[PDB]
Design a protein around this ligand. Sequence first.
Ligand code: NA
Ligand code: NA
Length: 327
Amino acid sequence: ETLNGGITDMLTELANFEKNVSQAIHKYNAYRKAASVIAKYPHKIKSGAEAKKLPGVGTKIAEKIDEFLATGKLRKLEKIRQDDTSSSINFLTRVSGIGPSAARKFVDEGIKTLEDLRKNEDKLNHHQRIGLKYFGDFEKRIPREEMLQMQDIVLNEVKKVDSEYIATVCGSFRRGAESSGDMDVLLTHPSFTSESTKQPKLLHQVVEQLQKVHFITDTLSKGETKFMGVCQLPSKNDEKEYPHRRIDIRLIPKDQYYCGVLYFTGSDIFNKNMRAHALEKGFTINEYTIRPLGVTGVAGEPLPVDSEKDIFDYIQWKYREPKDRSE
DNA sequence: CATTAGA
DNA sequence: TCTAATG
Ligand code: NA
Ligand code: NA
């Protein structure tokens, strides 16, 4: 956690590189597992050999470990950090909609900069066009102060269309958090669950609403169960217009809400820990349900959940407020 | 690890 | 269809 830090850190650096710049999933996979193990290792790695003893720890990585242990650096590291082609990839990749594939392709063509980006908007798909379009706004955190206003808003329409709709803004936001990256709205309806063959309009209705009043400005992706968009707080009695924010709303089978809700709310560690627990308590949890465990090794049978509580109860735990769902 | 675009 | 990108 700190005794192994650099090693791991250099390692992930390395790893991450092969993966995006090059296309060496393998090596990329090497660094990672090695990075994973040294990470665990209960003592100060004093040399490559020492390290080497490890699982997934090769001779190549031992080597890098020594140079790094000896000199507070790595050449390949330095060489990479410098590398413009590499540097460029790392960067394009910031635009919502650009990934390693497209990033490398763009370089090869020569778009290494944001401007290049613009000159070449034709060479960009709608997602990417907006990614670039709200680039600034997109990299900006969301003050809870604004979250609250947004929330207030969605909840109002959600309701206005059909009073049946159940909406929850999950995420850190929910967990009390001061700021947030984007707003995640968990959505379900009673007339929709596991079986009842969809109802696409179910999502479509609210999107249309939201857009109706201008909270939604754009559509990244809109499918029958997941809408990826862009919203914005009405820029008041001008002077201060609001940044364009990422927004996601997913339709859900009422029968699997709180599981989902439980989950999306996290934290990533809370979940695990919670998950790790249900297992002892003779269970299994996952993004949609919770099933009793049968000693045959495994077992099915989705228990019925009416709220975050049921789930707790089941695994017989202390209801932990979203606030303390930290770990 | 599942959902959407797109080509 | 497969393959990318997002979460
Ligand atoms: Na990106
Ligand atoms: Na393949």
